[PDB]
């Protein structure tokens, strides 16, 4: 019937918790803005499990964020297939985890995890031929990698059609 | 040349400072990994410098011009006397932005990977702008719901600075998509694939093509 907004709550989190939508929640409360102060009482029209997710202050994310939007070129005129696995190694280096240079080695050296969790490496076949691209899974179906566009570091969705197609599996490198 | 590793230093950060690549930096030092202890001493690449002796030049004058002695400049070139002739070749010795600790970026990162679906059956043109309004709600700025309203109700800006709303026309008919420009030419938005929030490059061919300008709400 009624919900009282707790600190950190959002219209998204509340709508999702009670199996409705932000729209319905705004309509039924006559809200015209997404602004939400603690103690605010919202009318409402079995809590679902929470996806594992990195913290904005996590060592893994902070490392990724340092390079976010920055092109990561391994050598003078190095190909993307080298840049992507060199970026992955560089991030993990900031965490004390040594990693092999090449995407291939990274793929073969580590044990396969069927459903990846925050920290695992996800691999793809861009050219179709072989596993030739790698990124760092961040949780919630997104991963960080050096992209085709100038090897700039970006965060994209694993559940995009292109990536679902070029997908090649995940590997574990930490605990 | 020589550099000693400080805590928090990386191959990338070191290569950048001394104007070289991570690849060469590893090869030259026989590194088997990117792992770098703060007690380490990495050999830096040395650049080759030559000088063709012009009229008026002497070994004493060239010594103080490049930062060396006449004796040092003599060994390197295998001379016995300070004699150089005109035309002789002498060897000679020897931008970012993003801040994780930021109100705007703290809020954005809160939604990474989240499928921000505003309604039960809402279009991406609505999802993306609801998301933008959602992030700014945590920064005390009340924005409209729709893309169309965020587009034509705020001052247009030539180039975008972090925070500004970047607009696109995925459809072609009208402006129907919006994101939050973060800096370094990347923007946060609800993606077409599943309304998932991602952070993509503004400089990708497609987005550079369907770009429709930037607006300032702050």
Numbering used by the authors:
A (entry chain A): 17 to 61, 117 to 246
B (entry chain B): 17 to 110, 122 to 245
From the primary publication:
LysM domains, which are frequently present as repetitive entities in both bacterial and plant proteins, are known to interact with carbohydrates containing N-acetylglucosamine (GlcNAc) moieties, such as chitin and peptidoglycan. Here, a structural study of the Thermus thermophilus NlpC/P60 endopeptidase containing two LysM domains is presented. Glycosidases, such as muraminidases and glucosaminidases, hydrolyze glycosidic bonds between carbo­hydrate units, while peptidases, such as amidases, l,d-endopeptidases, d,l-endopeptidases, l,d-carboxypeptidases and d,d-carboxypeptidases, hydrolyze amide bonds of the peptide stem at specific positions. d,l-Endopeptidases belonging to the papain-like peptidase superfamily possess an NlpC/P60 domain which is responsible for their catalytic activity. This domain is commonly associated with PGN-binding domains such as the SH3b domain, choline-binding domain or lysin motif (LysM).
The P60_tth structure was solved by the single-wavelength anomalous dispersion (SAD) method using selenomethionine-derivative protein. The final model contained two molecules in the asymmetric unit (chains A and B). Analysis of the crystal packing with the PISA server indicates that a stable homodimer is formed within the crystal. The catalytic domains dimerize via a surface area of about 980 Å2. This dimerization interface involves 17 residues mainly belonging to strand 8 (S8) and helix 5 (H5) of each monomer. Two salt bridges are established between the side chains of Arg223 and Glu230 from each catalytic domain. The interaction surface between LysM1 and the catalytic domain is 593 Å2. This interface involves residues in the vicinity of H6 from the catalytic domain and residues from H1 and H2 of LysM1. Overall, comparisons to known NlpC/P60 structures strongly suggest that P60_tth also functions as a d,l-endopeptidase involved in PGN hydrolysis.
